[PDB]
Design a protein around this ligand. Structure first.
Ligand SMILES: N#Cc1cnn2c(Nc3ccc4c(c3)CC(=O)N4)cc(Cl)nc12
Ligand SMILES: N#Cc1cnn2c(Nc3ccc4c(c3)CC(=O)N4)cc(Cl)nc12
Ligand SMILES: [Cl-]
Ligand SMILES: [Cl-]
Lengths: 123, 4, 123, 4
């Protein structure tokens, strides 16, 4: 018999992105080649099959630094991290290949789906 | 608010 | 020029509630009289003006235990914590007064609004 | 997915 506040989930995510922008309670740095990205482990796990696996691991759960595969593109990661915190994906002709490869590695199935559909439409 |  | 995934914010919140149920990466215990509630500080701040103030404080940000005012009803808190993690509010005749008082203390304006409207309709 |  619950009632539901439609905008609640979006409002929560907006405040989680505000915390990220202000670097409040971030508990991990994701290292992608020469670049570093601060984030909240809980948000990363909630969005990515890869981070969900990493941070449920009894040893990796306590690491403050995670190094991604050297093939991972920093811009692609940046675009996906922004998506995690906002629901918005900056998908462009010049970045689609890097975004799709990063989304496959991070196990973000909905992003992979759409990248596949956008590429198919251009061929 | 809505009835979900 | 971003695209947006409609269900993303809800999916994130569902996974944050899964983390709470499994007690993964919870970093605070909220003590309400004889009862204890484990949660994630980031979610509490994202939902509540009171917790936002508490956890931006340079000393309170590092506490693992927060004791609420002894006037706070544990069931009312439980209902509001469930709401924070699900967008669903278990608002009933028998709990509405406690829920509204807890929501005022926690500074959860949308919940206070609806409690006010539901009480007004019964008078 | 939508155009926001
Ligand atoms: N507890 C918990 C919890 C925290 N996070 N999380 C999941 N995170 C996840 C796992 C796989 C995938 C995605 C997110 C997006 C995607 O495409 N695949 C799943 C579950 Cl079943 N549970 C949890
Ligand atoms: N950074 C950050 C950040 C984390 N959380 N958070 C806010 N949390 C909040 C503050 C006040 C109220 C509510 C939530 C619900 C309500 O009724 N009042 C606000 C801002 Cl402006 N910023 C942040
Ligand atoms: Cl996704
Ligand atoms: Cl609220």
């Amino acid at each position: 018999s619950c009632i539901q506040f439609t905008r609640h989930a979006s409002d929560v995510l907006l405040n989680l992105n505000r915390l990220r922008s202000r670097d409040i309670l971030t508990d991990v740095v994701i290292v992608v080649s020469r670049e570093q990205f601060r984030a909240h482990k809980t948000v990363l796990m909630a969005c990515s099959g890869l981070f969900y696996s990493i941070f449920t691991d009894q040893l990796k759960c306590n690491l403050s630094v995670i190094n991604l595969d050297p093939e991972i593109n920093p811009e692609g990661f940046c675009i996906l991290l922004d998506f995690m915190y906002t629901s918005r994906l900056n998908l462009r002709e010049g970045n689609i290949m890097a975004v799709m490869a990063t989304a496959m590695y991070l196990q973000m199935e909905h992003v992979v789906d759409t990248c596949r559909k956008f590429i198919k439409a251009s061929e | 608010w809505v009835i979900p």
